[PDB]
Design a protein around this ligand. Sequence first.
Ligand code: CA
Ligand code: CA
Length: 338
Amino acid sequence: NTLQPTEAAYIAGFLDGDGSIYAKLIPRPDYKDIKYQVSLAISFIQRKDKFPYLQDIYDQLGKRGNLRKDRGDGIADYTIIGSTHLSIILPDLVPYLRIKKKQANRILHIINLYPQAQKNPSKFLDLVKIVDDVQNLNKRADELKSTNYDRLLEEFLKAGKIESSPTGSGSGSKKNTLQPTEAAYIAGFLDGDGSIYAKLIPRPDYKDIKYQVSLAISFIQRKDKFPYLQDIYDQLGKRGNLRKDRGDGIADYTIIGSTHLSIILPDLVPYLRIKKKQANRILHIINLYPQAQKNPSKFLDLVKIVDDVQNLNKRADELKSTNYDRLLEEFLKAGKIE
DNA sequence: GCAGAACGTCGTGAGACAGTTCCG
DNA sequence: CGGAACTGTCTCACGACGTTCTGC
Ligand SMILES: [Ca+2]
Ligand SMILES: [Ca+2]
């Protein structure tokens, strides 16, 4: 079972980003009495091309659960179903989990009560409540609230499985301090819900080269989960910009400029997976930018790194960035290189 | 002259299941 | 009977910026 602290932390970061912890009950037209089995799962979702990364997480989790290279729409998932695997896996992830920690504790709890709850409609209903919380915790505010417990209490009374009086508790409307696991999580989360990117900004008032290469990493999330960004922000020495809302209900945390990324990135690189290349390329740009400012020749092949980064932030089929082709044209016609 | 902050935004890349097929 | 695997998708929650807006 011995899964490494920074491997557990990364996965939790990644799960909190691109994963899902959830509970559901399945109709079972062949079960003894209670015709529902409560299903429990965690999953990791990602685009087809990044499958090796899922396959890697799989291998770390003792090769439990079922991988899927393609689920139909060029997109891949790794679902771990059942209490056998989850009672081994979740204990390892729960300490590092943040956004979905509650969901994980709930699943872990359902596991504890399931044996007894299994052939007792009273204790099954009480457990179905926990299935409700989990599905609710995965919901928005404005969304319809989970009514599995209500629909089953009605089903149990009609099927004569429960006598008076019924339960219960349901809404019945009838300097650094960035340590290994701190960085590992953040890298997990950035790999999931984050972005590492470079861009050319047109600056209509520069000495010679009228562009500046802008460098950034960002974190994106729904506004309700903003405090979690506010956490990562604090943990990174309080660098960069935060938005509680950018206008469309989704928050972001953006760290622009070599100054911050010279400090932050080296902390995340060793734990970064999906976005590690982008990270190093940014560091590389930071590394050879001083000399690149004056010389249009050194600016150009540095502008290639920008293209390369933007390329990495695309699938193979997308049209590849042409900043190098456009600036080469511009520099020739401005006589800056000939 | 320099560069970060803030604003706004296509076009997908996810989340979180519900069903349904296998399976000892 | 018991429950996990595999199929399939609807609805946003993201990404990765182009823009432009301050700030010394
Ligand atoms: Ca997410
Ligand atoms: Ca992602």
